[PDB]
Amino acid sequence: RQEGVAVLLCVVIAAWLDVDAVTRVLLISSVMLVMIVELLNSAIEAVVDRIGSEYHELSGRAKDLGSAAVLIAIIDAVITWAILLWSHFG
Amino acid sequence: AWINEAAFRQEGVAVLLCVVIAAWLDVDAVTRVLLISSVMLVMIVELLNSAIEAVVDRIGSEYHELSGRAKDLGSAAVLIAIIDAVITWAILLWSHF
Amino acid sequence: TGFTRIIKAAGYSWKGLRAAWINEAAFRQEGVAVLLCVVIAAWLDVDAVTRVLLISSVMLVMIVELLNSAIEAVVDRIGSEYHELSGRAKDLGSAAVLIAIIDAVITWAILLWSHFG
Numbered sequence: 001r002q003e004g005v006a007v008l009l010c011v012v013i014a015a016w017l018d019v020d021a022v023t024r025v026l027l028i029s030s031v032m033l034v035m036i037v038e039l040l041n042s043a044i045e046a047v048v049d050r051i052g053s054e055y056h057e058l059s060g061r062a063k064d065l066g067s068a069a070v071l072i073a074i075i076d077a078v079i080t081w082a083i084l085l086w087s088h089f090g
Numbered sequence: 091a092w093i094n095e096a097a098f099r100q101e102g103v104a105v106l107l108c109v110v111i112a113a114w115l116d117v118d119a120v121t122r123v124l125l126i127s128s129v130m131l132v133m134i135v136e137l138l139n140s141a142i143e144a145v146v147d148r149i150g151s152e153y154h155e156l157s158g159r160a161k162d163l164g165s166a167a168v169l170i171a172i173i174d175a176v177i178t179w180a181i182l183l184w185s186h187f
Numbered sequence: 188t189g190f191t192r193i194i195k196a197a198g199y200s201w202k203g204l205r206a207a208w209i210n211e212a213a214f215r216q217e218g219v220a221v222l223l224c225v226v227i228a229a230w231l232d233v234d235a236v237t238r239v240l241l242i243s244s245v246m247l248v249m250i251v252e253l254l255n256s257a258i259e260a261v262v263d264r265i266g267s268e269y270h271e272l273s274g275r276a277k278d279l280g281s282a283a284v285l286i287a288i289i290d291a292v293i294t295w296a297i298l299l300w301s302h303f304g
């Protein structure tokens with residue numbers, strides 16, 4: 001899974017950077033949050049597919065809501081990394 | 091296709107306004123990240139809760155105890171996320187202002 | 188109209204917490220651990236950002252625990268028979284819960300170390 005590669009890289013970079021414990025916790029948690037939301041989104045998708053492969057308005061609605069959740073989580077991670085790194089290198 | 095709903099617009103706008111306020115506050119970087127992520131988590135959780143509700147409704151209109159339980163548990167998640175946001179903002183802005 | 192939704196959702200929420208509490212010792216013990224951590228964090232001599240990280244990390248455990256149990260309830264609602272996708276939904280949801288918990292433990296270990304070590 002190439003999401004776990006993305007994670008280890010983030011952990012390494014956060015480890016590699018010379019920041020204090022708080023910053024490192026925020027950098028890493030924001031990435032872990034994306035992982036948690038992706039997994040929950042995938043669980044919901046699995047349930048939707050369990051019900052039927054045929055299209056339905058509410059199946060689409062479920063999947064789109066789940067995907068927006070993942071998107072908000074990724075945006076939060078980008079913002080977190082941008083803010084902490086700008087401040088670290090200020 | 092869901093952004094055109096009174097409930098999501100109201101929740102979305104509150105979160106958006108909080109992110110905007112946080113972007114303008116004179117706080118340090120760690121504080122700013124915490125103010126922003128705590129409200130974004132409210133939105134994430136609310137979206138996952140609506141996702142689950144949609145799957146429940148997909149199954150049908152016949153009531154089942156577990157259908158009610160799924161929706162209740164999703165709402166409780168949102169509630170905890172909201173409390174966490176209030177606690178985060180209160181602790182950080184008491185400290186600062 | 189925006190006030191009736193709050194009262195309504197609040198009621199669903201309480202029923203969610205109540206059902207989870209009544210139905211499983213493990214949930215009750217988790218809730219005890221969470222409440223303990225929040226109380227402890229609230230009384231520790233640490234800066235405000237550390238205090239928020241200690242509290243929000245255990246709250247996230249509770250948030251993911253509840254979303255996952257919501258997913259379990261839907262799966263069980265559909266049927267009790269074995270189905271690959273049913274198993275997969277629960278596997279993914281449980282993985283998410285475990286990540287939240289491990290992150291909480293590590294967050295607490297790091298911050299309590301840095302503050303004491």
Ligand SMILES: CCCCCCCC/C=C\CCCCCC(=O)OC[C@@H](O)CO
Binds near residue numbers: 218221222
């Ligand atoms: C600041 C902390 C906020 C909360 C943090 C998360 C805590 C979540 C855990 C538990 C909430 C209470 C659950 C209801 C209690 C309950 O059902 O009692 C049994 C009776 O119902 C029996 O009739």
Ligand SMILES: CCCCCCCC/C=C\CCCCCC(=O)OC[C@@H](O)CO
Binds near residue numbers: 222226230
């Ligand atoms: C329903 C479950 C509730 C769980 C939480 C119950 C609240 C009590 C929890 C823990 C108490 C143990 C530690 C006490 C030590 C103490 O007196 O320290 C005071 C000083 O540190 C103040 O500076």
Ligand SMILES: CCCCCCCC/C=C\CCCCCC(=O)OC[C@@H](O)CO
Binds near residue numbers: 230
């Ligand atoms: C919801 C009910 C609240 C009831 C609250 C009852 C009082 C609880 C107070 C403190 C909990 C113990 C942990 C903090 C103790 C402390 O300062 O430790 C500093 C270090 O030397 C050791 O970690």
Ligand SMILES: CCCCCCCC/C=C\CCCCCC(=O)OC[C@H](O)CO
Binds near residue numbers: 086
């Ligand atoms: C949807 C639109 C998003 C567009 C994004 C891509 C474009 C950004 C390109 C270059 C950066 C220019 C230099 C700006 C540096 C910058 O942002 O600095 C922060 C402060 O310096 C912190 O204090």
Ligand SMILES: CCCCCCCC/C=C\CCCCCC(=O)OC[C@H](O)CO
Binds near residue numbers: 105108111176
């Ligand atoms: C001088 C300092 C001024 C400080 C101004 C503070 C304004 C924000 C207040 C509380 C915390 C954020 C709100 C947390 C709850 C939240 O975002 O709820 C969304 C919807 O209500 C439900 O989706």
Ligand SMILES: CCCCCCCC/C=C\CCCCCC(=O)OC[C@H](O)CO
Binds near residue numbers: 107108114116
């Ligand atoms: C949720 C809706 C709330 C609606 C009412 C909101 C009222 C305005 C409050 C705060 C704005 C920020 C004010 C402080 C700006 C601030 O800290 O500025 C310092 C430096 O000048 C920055 O460089």
Ligand SMILES: CCCCCCCC/C=C\CCCCCC(=O)OC[C@H](O)CO
Binds near residue numbers: 078086087
């Ligand atoms: C979606 C792409 C996001 C791309 C990034 C947008 C982030 C915007 C947030 C806040 C503005 C604050 C800008 C300053 C950030 C920063 O690190 O400031 C040092 C301390 O915040 C105060 O000393």
Ligand SMILES: CCCCCCCC/C=C\CCCCCC(=O)OC[C@H](O)CO
Binds near residue numbers: 172177184185233235
């Ligand atoms: C539906 C929402 C329910 C949620 C209810 C929340 C009530 C307020 C909680 C905590 C703030 C008290 C903060 C006062 C003491 C204080 O200054 O704490 C900050 C410090 O800066 C930390 O170090």
Ligand SMILES: CCCCCCCC/C=C\CCCCCC(=O)OC[C@H](O)CO
Binds near residue numbers: 173185228
């Ligand atoms: C249902 C919601 C229940 C909410 C439960 C959790 C509430 C945590 C609040 C405060 C902890 C901090 C206590 C005060 C810390 C403190 O002294 O901060 C100021 C100093 O002056 C800074 O130097």
